[PDB]
């Protein structure tokens, strides 16, 4: 408010403050330096809360341990912000990059996991037969199974791009910890992806749903007369 107050006094001329000129000349330099400063400040915040970190403490710490002075340093008496800023910026980028590169891989995995599950089985209007549904669905199973592998191949490639990102050793206990964490998401995702289609069978197969809707049969049964017993293609048994 002082910085704005000085400018309006010069506009009306009348009188001016004593030794507030020095604050008003540099004023412009503060308004570049505050924005410039901000730049980094933000990034730090959204850097602190991005973690879940017990993997890659040292880096983050090093940024804390790097920042831990400055703040101490900070005195508007003498601003050498230009540098500081930039040294941070060369290291906040690099870090900010590794964070995102990793995050980006996880989101892409989740997206890949959703995309492959679709609808395990599809039903074609009117009935056909047991072997004819086996013949029909073989073509769809082969296409659906490959789409999972292709998605699985991407996910596997995206894990390597986290190592190239973070630049941490496979031997170190941290990256192992995470390497297990990623597989569990793929496990859970596979669990859901497998469940969703098993539920899609449960709706078509359970008698209380198919009755309430006007949904047709789905399998065929042939019945041949036998002397020793009643013969069906499906036998109506295990």
């Amino acid at each position: 408010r002082l910085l704005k107050e000085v400018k309006y006094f010069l506009l009306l001329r009348l009188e001016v403050p004593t030794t507030a000129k020095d604050i008003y000349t540099k004023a412009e330099t503060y308004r570049t330096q505050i924005v410039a400063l901000d730049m980094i400040v933000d990034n730090y915040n959204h850097i602190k809360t991005c973690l879940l970190e017990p993997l890659v403490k040292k880096k983050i710490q090093d940024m804390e341990e790097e920042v831990k002075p400055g703040i101490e340093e900070i005195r508007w008496k003498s601003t050498n912000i230009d540098q500081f800023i930039s040294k941070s910026k060369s290291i906040v980028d690099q870090l900010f990059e590794t964070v995102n590169k990793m995050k980006d891989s996880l989101q892409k995995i989740h997206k890949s996991l959703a995309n492959f599950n679709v609808k395990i089985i599809e039903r074609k209007n009117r009935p056909m037969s047991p072997d004819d549904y086996d013949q029909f669905l073989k073509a769809i199973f082969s296409n659906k199974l490959t789409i999972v592998k292709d998605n699985g191949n991407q996910i596997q490639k995206l894990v390597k791009e986290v190592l190239d990102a973070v630049k941490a050793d496979k031997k170190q206990n941290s990256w192992k910890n995470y390497n297990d964490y990623v597989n569990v998401i793929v496990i859970e995702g596979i669990s859901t992806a497998i469940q969703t289609a098993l539920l899609h069978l449960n709706e078509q197969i359970n008698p209380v749903f198919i009755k309430r809707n006007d949904i047709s049969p789905l399998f065929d049964i042939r019945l041949e007369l036998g002397q020793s017993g009643i013969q069906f293609d499906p036998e109506i048994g295990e």
Binding site: K176, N177, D180, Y181, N183, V184, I187
Partner: protein, 48 residues
């Protein structure tokens, strides 16, 4: 989970698998002994 526990005179032995620390999932090569008198957990590694 899905492991095994054999009891002997004054000592319980567990060899079983499907488990791990944190998120990791695998089967166990290792046999963990405990002495029921105190309930002390000692991992025992065979020479074989």
């Amino acid at each position: 989970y899905g492991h095994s526990a054999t009891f002997f005179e004054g000592k319980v032995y567990i060899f079983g698998g499907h488990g791990g620390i944190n998120y990791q999932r695998l089967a166990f090569n290792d046999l963990y002994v405990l002495e029921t008198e105190n309930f002390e957990w000692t991992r025992l590694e065979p020479k074989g």
